[PDB]
Write a protein that binds this ligand. Sequence first.
Ligand code: B12
Ligand code: SF4
Ligand code: SF4
Ligand SMILES: [Cl-]
Ligand code: NA
Length: 698
Amino acid sequence: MRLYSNRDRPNHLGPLALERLARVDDVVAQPARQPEDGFAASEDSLLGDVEEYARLFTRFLDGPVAPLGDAIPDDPARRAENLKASAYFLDASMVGICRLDPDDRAGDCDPSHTHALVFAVQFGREPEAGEAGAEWIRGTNAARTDMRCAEIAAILSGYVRWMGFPARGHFSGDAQVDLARLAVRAGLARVVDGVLVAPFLRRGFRLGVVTTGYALAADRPLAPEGDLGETAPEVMLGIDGTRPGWEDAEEEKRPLHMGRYPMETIRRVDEPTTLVVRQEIQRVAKRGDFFKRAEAGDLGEKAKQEKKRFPMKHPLALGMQPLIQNMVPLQGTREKLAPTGKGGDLSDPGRNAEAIKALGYYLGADFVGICRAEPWMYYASDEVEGKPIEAYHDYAVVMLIDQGYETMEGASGDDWISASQSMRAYMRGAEIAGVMAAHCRRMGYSARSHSNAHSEVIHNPAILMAGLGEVSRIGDTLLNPFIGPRSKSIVFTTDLPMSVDRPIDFGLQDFCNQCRKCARECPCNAISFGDKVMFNGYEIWKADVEKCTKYRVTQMKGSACGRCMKMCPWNREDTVEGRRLAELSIKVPEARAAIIAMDDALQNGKRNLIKRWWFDLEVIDGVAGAPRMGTNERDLSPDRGDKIGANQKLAMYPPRLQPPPGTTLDAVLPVDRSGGLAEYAAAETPAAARARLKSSAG
Ligand code: B12
Ligand code: SF4
Ligand code: SF4
Ligand SMILES: [Cl-]
Ligand code: NA
């Protein structure tokens, strides 16, 4: 939570006030090492698990280089900006660039590399002694942070390669250059008693590097002696939109298992705020996921042909792809395992829940919750062989990763960066859950993660039962009171016993009932302007998933879409002013209509041009080029009818209109749009459902 907005600050400058520190042109080099853990790891810890994912990311530090197209901007200052903004987008804490000199190119480094992108990732917060999970995490920060450096270095390496320039990533596990030296030269750190010290990162950090012949404007080293200006009043208050100087210390007062956002102040309820009738919920084949439908031909030729490609049109997304795909085989086991003895005392489920949450926040989740994995949350059958899926684990641990407010401010929602937002949050989530599930397995509890590339559960109902969101108008997206609908979830299921969270009520039903903004702004009118309906046993505002799927897969003026998330009033900057509007919305019902109307009069959702840090590049046949058909640049739309609720006819595809369990990708089942439209018109009202259920319980 900042005090001042960053709405006028370009993304390449990052969340810290690096531009206010004292700098000089050059410094004298000297021996230096990276920060290490204070304490050593206890015997059984997370160490083995973060090391496995670090080895995996090591494989993608190099790779093939695409041919050079003609759309890469020449100016090294503009390349520098974009690459620093890319690194902040992946959650580097600090970024700089320096020139590579002959002492660096003389080792195993490719001799055509002239430049280095240098980035730091801050150590995560550790639990205190005696807190749940302390022994899992204590002493693993170098390795946990290295794994994240490797991930970032691989993704960015891969981006530059796909732009057509050779590039290689480096980190402590695998480096051909002196990392520490470069961090000094690029102006991230200074040396104290042979150890790097970085302004603002008081917990310690580790480094990643990308070397490349892609020429870039270089930064200047920090002044080597004395105070740099990190406590000047402008910096302490963060007037330009940066982190206040006391934010770290205020956050450290909260125990790590509570997260950064105060989810403890939200009202909990036993039953969710919308009707869920478990006995009437049928399980759905994986083959009914509408992307799988698209893949198999159910939605027509165009959609079939675009399905592999639609989210991989931008080079940055293609940098992520190999990590995403190769995490899949590590997702874990469905079989029961024997407890192992490792992991300290596991007999208290309340403490286990705290430990798992802490672990999630240590690895970088924004929200962690836990619910029972009910059988109706698992798909009925897989889509490749058509075999039944068993409800094999008892618990679902559900994490939210924020898609990134600032990037989205700059975007249309359906332009060239949309899919990269999705993919970054899927990638990061899969990494976190992979590690966490792996840790459960090392303790002898079966655990398996469920990513965008391979999932056997439907995230939504778990997000709901874990109390991380309420049902919203957008439809197939649940909304959180602090980051709104701006998230991707990741889930791992496991048998580790844990107390469960409970659903939340923060007044969203009433708020969404007076708002239509997401619906108004959807490019294909997929989002309902009317009332909630019953759908496969539960109450929901059902969007038209056919129309949405066709637009996201097929539209040629960007890479997919998430405009609905962008335009929602609950999607807000992490500032005091933002948080206060969220609190008003929750605590003061009379204010909601006013907030809804003012969100428009203030032009929230307008594209903010300062935040547009990315290049409009479309990869066609292995080469990046300017967008063939152009680029979506949408603005706010005017109001629709008072009568649009009554006139819009959407289709819905509950189980009866889906491919049945057992169907694979080899079969085709053309979508029955007629039937889906008539099914929507026949859907039961929630009110009638409530009364029908009451009439049985007499
Ligand atoms: C396929 C898919 C889509 C497709 C097709 C949807 C469909 N229904 O087939 C389309 C393209 C429409 C789509 C769009 C988007 N999606 Co999508 N999608 C998925 C995916 C991969 C599978 C859904 C599914 O398996 N099939 C659909 C069958 C099962 O659906 P159904 O019978 O219609 O049921 C749906 C809902 O009713 C709900 N649901 C099921 N049972 C229950 C029970 C209860 C009680 C409740 C309340 C809800 C609920 O889950 C289904 C979601 O599609 C999930 C990931 C996952 N494994 O769940 C992400 C997922 C739902 N998508 C998500 C998002 C964010 C998007 C987009 C915003 C795109 C983006 N840029 O990120 C848009 C939002 C569109 C909208 N209006 O909501 C997020 C939602 C997270 C959240 N905060 O709740 C998910 C969970 C991915 C993730 N891991 O974060 N998506
Ligand atoms: S519902 Fe689909 S198409 Fe509509 S705005 Fe959301 S993501 Fe885009
Ligand atoms: S835009 Fe309005 S209606 Fe749509 S989800 Fe957000 S609050 Fe609800
Ligand atoms: Cl999606
Ligand atoms: Na908004």
